[PDB]
Amino acid sequence: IIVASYTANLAAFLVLDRPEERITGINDPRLRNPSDKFIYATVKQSSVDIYFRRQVELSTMYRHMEKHNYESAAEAIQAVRDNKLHAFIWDSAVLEFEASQKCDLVTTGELFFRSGFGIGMRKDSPWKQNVSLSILKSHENGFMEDLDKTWVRYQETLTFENMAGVFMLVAGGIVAGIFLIFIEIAYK
Amino acid sequence: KEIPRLDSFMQPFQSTLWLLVGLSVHVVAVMLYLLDRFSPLTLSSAMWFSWGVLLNSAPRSFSARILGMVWAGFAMIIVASYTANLAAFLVLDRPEERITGINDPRLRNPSDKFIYATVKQSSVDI
Amino acid sequence: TRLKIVTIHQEPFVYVKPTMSDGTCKEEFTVNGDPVKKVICTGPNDTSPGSPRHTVPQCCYGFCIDLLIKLARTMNFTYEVHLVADGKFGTQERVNNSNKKEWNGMMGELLSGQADMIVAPLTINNERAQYIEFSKPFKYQGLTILVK
Amino acid sequence: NGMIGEVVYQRAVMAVGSLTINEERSEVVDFSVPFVETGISVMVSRSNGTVSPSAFLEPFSASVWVMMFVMLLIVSAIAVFVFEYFSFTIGKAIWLLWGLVFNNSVPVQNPKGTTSKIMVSVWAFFAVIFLASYTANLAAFMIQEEFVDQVTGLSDKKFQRPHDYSPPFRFGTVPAGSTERNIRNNYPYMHQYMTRFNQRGVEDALVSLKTGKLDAFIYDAAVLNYKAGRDEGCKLVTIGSGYIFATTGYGIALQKGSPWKRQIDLALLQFVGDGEMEELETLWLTGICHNIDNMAGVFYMLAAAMALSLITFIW
Ligand SMILES: *[C@@H]1O[C@H](CO)[C@@H](O[C@@H]2O[C@H](CO)[C@@H](O)[C@H](O)[C@H]2NC(C)=O)[C@H](O)[C@H]1NC(C)=O
Ligand SMILES: *[C@@H]1O[C@H](CO)[C@@H](O)[C@H](O)[C@H]1NC(C)=O
Numbered sequence: 048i049i050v051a052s053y054t055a056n057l058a059a060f061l062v063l064d065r066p067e068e069r070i071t072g073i074n075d076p077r078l079r080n081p082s083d084k085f086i087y088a089t090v091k092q093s094s095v096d097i098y099f100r101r102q103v104e105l106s107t108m109y110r111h112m113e114k115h116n117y118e119s120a121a122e123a124i125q126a127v128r129d130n131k132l133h134a135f136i137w138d139s140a141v142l143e144f145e146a147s148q149k150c151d152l153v154t155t156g157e158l159f160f161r162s163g164f165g166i167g168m169r170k171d172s173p174w175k176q177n178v179s180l181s182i183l184k185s186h187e188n189g190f191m192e193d194l195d196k197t198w199v200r201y202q203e204t205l206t207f208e209n210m211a212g213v214f215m216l217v218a219g220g221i222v223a224g225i226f227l228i229f230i231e232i233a234y235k
Numbered sequence: 236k237e238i239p240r241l242d243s244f245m246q247p248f249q250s251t252l253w254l255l256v257g258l259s260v261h262v263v264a265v266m267l268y269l270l271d272r273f274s275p276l277t278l279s280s281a282m283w284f285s286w287g288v289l290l291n292s293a294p295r296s297f298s299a300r301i302l303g304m305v306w307a308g309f310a311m312i313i314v315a316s317y318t319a320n321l322a323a324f325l326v327l328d329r330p331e332e333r334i335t336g337i338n339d340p341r342l343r344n345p346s347d348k349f350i351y352a353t354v355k356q357s358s359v360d361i
Numbered sequence: 362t363r364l365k366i367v368t369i370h371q372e373p374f375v376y377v378k379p380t381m382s383d384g385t386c387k388e389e390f391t392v393n394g395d396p397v398k399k400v401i402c403t404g405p406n407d408t409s410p411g412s413p414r415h416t417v418p419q420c421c422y423g424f425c426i427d428l429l430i431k432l433a434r435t436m437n438f439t440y441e442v443h444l445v446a447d448g449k450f451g452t453q454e455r456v457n458n459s460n461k462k463e464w465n466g467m468m469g470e471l472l473s474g475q476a477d478m479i480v481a482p483l484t485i486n487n488e489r490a491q492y493i494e495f496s497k498p499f500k501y502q503g504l505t506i507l508v509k
Numbered sequence: 510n511g512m513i514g515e516v517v518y519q520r521a522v523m524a525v526g527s528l529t530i531n532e533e534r535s536e537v538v539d540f541s542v543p544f545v546e547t548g549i550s551v552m553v554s555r556s557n558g559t560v561s562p563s564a565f566l567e568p569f570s571a572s573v574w575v576m577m578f579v580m581l582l583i584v585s586a587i588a589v590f591v592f593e594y595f596s597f598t599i600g601k602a603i604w605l606l607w608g609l610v611f612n613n614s615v616p617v618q619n620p621k622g623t624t625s626k627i628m629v630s631v632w633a634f635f636a637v638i639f640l641a642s643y644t645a646n647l648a649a650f651m652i653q654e655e656f657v658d659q660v661t662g663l664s665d666k667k668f669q670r671p672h673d674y675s676p677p678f679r680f681g682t683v684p685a686g687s688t689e690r691n692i693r694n695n696y697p698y699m700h701q702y703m704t705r706f707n708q709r710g711v712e713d714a715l716v717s718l719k720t721g722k723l724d725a726f727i728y729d730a731a732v733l734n735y736k737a738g739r740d741e742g743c744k745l746v747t748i749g750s751g752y753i754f755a756t757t758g759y760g761i762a763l764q765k766g767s768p769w770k771r772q773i774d775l776a777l778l779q780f781v782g783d784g785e786m787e788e789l790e791t792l793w794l795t796g797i798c799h800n801i802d803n804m805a806g807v808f809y810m811l812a813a814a815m816a817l818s819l820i821t822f823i824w
């Protein structure tokens with residue numbers, strides 16, 4: 048009964064306590080009243096900064112991230128790589144490629160502000176209409192598709208955590224038991 | 236949502252694997268007796284030892300011990316997996332069997348199954 | 362024919378590698394044998410605290426470079442790939458003449474005539490489209506939170 | 510015909526209702542900005558995802574397995590040393606050892622080797638604890654909710670010819686639509702396979718998916734997502750989110766030269782960039798729809814073990 052309780056308890060340790068440890072709901076006002084450990088930043092002079100300044104409830108996040116303005120997003124990559132950050136608003140597929148690079152950088156599930164990325168253009172130009180037609184010609188075929196197959200689609204809970212210290216301690220106990228066997232053979 | 240309580244032991248569960256184990260241990264006994272006749276109360280003892288391997292609680296097996304150890308390890312890992320998925324069946328059997336609040340999109344276009352009503356001429360109806 | 366293409370260092374889209382021997386690009390391959398089609402761009406090290414002034418022609422590649430290669434394959438034109446001076450998008454920040462907010466960055470270099478086309482996945486918003494025309498969005502991409 | 514016949518022939522001003530965006534409609538008139546990310550997708554019947562793997566050794570014990578056999582051979586060699594120190598444990602220590610691992614009623618011998626008894630006791634405690642950990646790891650493998658797909662591409666191997674696969678599948682669209690023009694702009698052979706499997710309407714194909722008289726249905730992305738969020742029993746769920754598709758959107762086509770167009774585009778930008786479009790998406794979508802026996806592969810390994818025992822049996 049004791050060792051069955053032990054087996055079921057070892058089953059019970061890996062039962063999913065702490066499913067998610069942050070406040071990843073974007074409408075949760077814990078980010079509206081943050082703490083010292085909530086280091087969330089933005090790139091300086093970003094479009095997301097204009098999107099936040101456009102509304103009326105983004106005041107505290109703006110006041111926090113204006114104390115945390117970054118030149119490049121690679122600065123944010125290095126900061127959350129060194130665990131200086133705690134959250135960063137960024138485009139989805141770029142963070143997906145970074146999660147394919149390094150598995151510690153994990154996105155969240157709430158997809159907000161489904162935006163569109165185009166090409167910066169001038170005003171009315173003959174090199175705008177055929178350009179948009181060539182963009183649509185890229186849309187109709189699988190050109191963005193196989194360019195996502197090149198690197199975007201290309202990525203780059205087992206018995207392995209609970210074995211290493213177990214292997215070392217059991218091997219040490221085996222060697223110590225063999226030494227005690229040498230002692231007991233020397234006794235007789 | 237109150238569903239009363241066989242927990243899918245043999246009759247709700249699919250009944251192929253017990254016949255598969257029976258035919259498999261039959262083939263085991265056939266190849267053990269081909270090993271017995273082509274040896275490089277014995278028959279009933281080898282049958283009862285073939286049951287005793289599965290019994291989970293030994294004749295001359297000079298090359299048959301490999302057969303016995305593979306069959307025994309397979310039998311214990313199969314019954315361990317069966318313990319695992321029966322506990323998995325009885326623990327994680329909590330589906331969504333309610334409305335989940337007033338903001339249910341599934342009751343915006345209901346049918347004759349989700350039968351909901353109210354008191355005639357109530358203030359909640361107003 | 363002369364199209365001064367400006368860009369910012371985008372980490373998955375604009376890979377900026379120094380030249381191998383003298384202004385040259387290494388013919389590296391992808392994961393399926395397709396060779397990487399780089400281009401000659403003009404980039405500095407960093408901003409003004411990083412490097413004082415050191416801008417060299419290096420090899421820019423990634424996604425939008427091959428997209429512009431597909432454009433030049435489609436339409437009959439030439440181009441000129443260069444980088445952006447700062448490391449910012451370019452917003453309507455104040456100028457020191459009695460608090461008058463103007464534009465800078467990629468928009469400040471495009472409206473000055475120094476740039477011709479900003480091939481960059483910029484977030485299309487209201488006020489930037491109020492002043493200049495945009496293209497149709499090639500990328501359909503949202504926003505999310507990166508955690509550890 | 511339709512709204513294109515009403516706007517291009519100038520009998521109507523614009524179509525404020527939703528509209529797909531493709532090549533020739535952009536050629537005849539100018540759309541608005543794409544206000545919603547609505548590509549195309551395929552509704553399928555059911556993934557039939559059951560939590561049972563075909564293999565149980567290599568996805569579970571790969572790096573542990575080598576050290577387990579190394580320590581097994583070390584303990585067996587020590588038992589050989591003890592049996593040769595002071596009545597069948599010359600080479601038969603391995604069967605005794607791995608039979609006392611499981612304790613499946615294996616009568617072996619009465620051990621008088623005290624060192625052998627101590628090593629059997631330590632290895633038996635070790636066997637109990639890694640058996641407990643392996644049951645816990647089977648529970649942990651059950652903990653995640655996964656689903657096995659079958660068609661993972663627009664260039665799928667099923668799409669060549671369904672004679673290769675033992676179940677013949679089925680897929681069709683509605684006539685006189687832009688979906689057929691997009692498929693004909695992709696593959697004529699796909700239209701050749703789809704023409705024999707034509708059907709009437711969207712909800713008719715939905716009922717065909719409910720009753721099981723349809724396998725695949727090519728349509729737009731977000732409308733199928735809205736129909737899947739209201740699916741009874743949570744069965745009709747698409748695979749992916751338009752990742753292997755053209756990934757178009759929805760726009761408002763106006764006449765080429767309309768002065769209202771810039772105001773409409775800036776109003777759409779204003780509606781998107783304040784959460785009001787997000788409020789409309791909350792009002793008109795749903796996302797509550799979140800995410801038993803696959804045996805006989807180890808029986809193929811069992812048959813391979815039978816073949817190897819027959820190889821060793823002849824000599
Ligand atoms: C960043 O800019 C610095 C400064 O211009 C460059 O440093 C020079 O590098 C060359 C080659 O090693 C040296 O001969 C010079 O003496 C360096 N100058 C100074 C003042 O440090 C550097 O090359 C640039 N970074 C890169 C690698 O592009
Ligand atoms: C578009 O197409 C051709 C080739 O690019 C060019 O000669 C023509 O002047 C262009 N006209 C428009 C509509 O921009």
Ligand SMILES: *[C@@H]1O[C@H](CO)[C@@H](O)[C@H](O)[C@H]1NC(C)=O
Nearest residue numbers: 362433434435436437438439
């Ligand atoms: C591109 O333009 C030049 C201008 O002289 C013309 O002569 C040539 O035929 C064109 N070539 C292509 C590839 O269209």
Ligand SMILES: *[C@@H]1O[C@H](CO)[C@@H](O)[C@H](O)[C@H]1NC(C)=O
Nearest residue numbers: 454455456457458459460461
């Ligand atoms: C420029 O603006 C700054 C803002 O602080 C202010 O000092 C002054 O009005 C202007 N010029 C100088 C002297 O910096």
